[PDB]
Amino acid sequence: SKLIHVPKEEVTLDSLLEEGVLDKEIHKAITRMEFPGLTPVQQKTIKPILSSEDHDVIARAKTGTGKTFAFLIPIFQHLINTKFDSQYMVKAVIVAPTRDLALQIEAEVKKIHDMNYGLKKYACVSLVGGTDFRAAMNKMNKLRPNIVIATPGRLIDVLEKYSNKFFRFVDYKVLDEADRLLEIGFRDDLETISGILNEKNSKSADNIKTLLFSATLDDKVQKLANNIMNKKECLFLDTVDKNEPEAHERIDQSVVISEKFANSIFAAVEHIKKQIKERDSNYKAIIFAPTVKFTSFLCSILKNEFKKDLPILEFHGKITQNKRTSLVKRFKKDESGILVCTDVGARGMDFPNVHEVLQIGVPSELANYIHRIGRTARSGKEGSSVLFICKDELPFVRELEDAKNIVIAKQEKYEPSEEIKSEVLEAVTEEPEDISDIVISLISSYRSCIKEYRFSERRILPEIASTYGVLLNDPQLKIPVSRRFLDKLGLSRSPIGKAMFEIR
RNA sequence: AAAAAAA
Ligand SMILES: O=c1ccn([C@@H]2O[C@H](COP(=O)(O)OP(=O)(O)O)[C@@H](O)[C@H]2O)c(=O)[nH]1
Ligand code: BEF
Ligand SMILES: [Mg+2]
């Protein structure tokens, strides 16, 4: 308790200025960006967030509808109307599930800064992994930022060491893409963070206001966050009807269903090839893959196939953070190209004018389907989406309707010609051992979501394994492994293990 | 070994 709902039933910068809620400095900043007008969530979120009363804020809004400024504008306004207290102390802590999203939010704050130098006094520092710790701390000491954007790990590192120095006067903490940060693997980290910030706060352990933002969340998050929500009441600001699908309606969704999993790649290649020809290389797209190794492999194929027409960018968690930042900014700027990536780029990342979102296989989690396709059709723009799967993945499409009420109308089958298989497979440089590691990674990936997506383990896993045979152009062939490895896999008893591997 | 998450 206590969760108060406010379902989706005009607010303007000028009105907010004249009403006295917002200062001229920030009004100048947002007005100079020349947006047509505040998004519904911003209209529905700003004023309640500044309400000093003892209440937390949960906000659900579809993808690409400007949630970032929905909590950045209030933060800045808060910093304005508290400017003579604690000045050189952190007053707002923003947490994101990925480094690039945190750096993106930082860039948005610096975008706010560049539109009005008067707001630069309210400095900002990002705290993420893959960056020099000392340089960040020197930046912390030098700037005395009022806003911190961070990823949980590095934030915890900093908090364990400098909570007293910087974080004793936090008034706001923000969970962007809250639901993922409230999933297993992140919840304990955020509980430690909230605990430290609350423990270290100068006024009270319940002083801090918490903001939860995402395109995908329900009432379950209210329960999942009960330990990090200090205040007594909690506002639910929803710009989506209960039964309405969370997916952005402007996205033209489709699914390509194949007999086997491997030739969904062939399905995608035929799709992209059709797209570069029709659009005359004026094509900007993001293609998602379930795993790093498969991302890299798929990247190698798309490089062999389409490098002559478009840039092919490889984006995943094993890419050095410097290169991640370089390619996100490049793919942010460039007018065309193919971003080949895992779910690291599924949430939050804002790439202007992405034409299509492609998916080979399923996402690491069901909700990430909504966020994946959310990378296109942003800020009023149009967009389409294609899901490339095999028949044994069909239950996932079934799961999309039962839970999230997501109905993919356009569905079609696919069978590859011998020519494309020969052309693609002949142009693979990877040794059988690499193919083995890649397929093994896919087996591991699909095994971890058997329960979630209601897959038939006895059917889907052998199919994933068969990809090894397909790529080596011998469907009868099975993956060569050792007895210890097969035992280590724990399929020593399962017939599927025998059906999918060959102990050589 | 899955996708994230500083060591
Ligand atoms: O008042 C606004 C705020 C947002 N935007 C658009 O929304 C985008 C921001 O999307 P964001 O990622 O911040 O929202 P989210 O994806 O988190 O829902 C900007 O680039 C703008 O094009 C807009 O048109 N008017
Ligand atoms: F949901 Be938005 F893409 F951050
Ligand atoms: Mg966001």
Residue numbers in the entry: 88 to 96, 101 to 595
Sentences copied from the publication:
(D) Model for RNA duplex binding and unwinding by Mss116. of short duplexes bound to D2 by excluding one RNA strand and bending the other. hydrolysis leads to core re-opening and enzyme turnover in DEAD-box proteins and perhaps other SF1 and SF2 helicases. ‘clamp’ ssRNA and form a highly stable closed-state complex.
A10-RNA + NDP-BeFx, N = A, C, G, or U. However, each base interacts differently in the ATP-binding pocket. base are missing in the structures with CDP- or UDP-BeFx. lower efficiency irrespective of the nucleotide base.
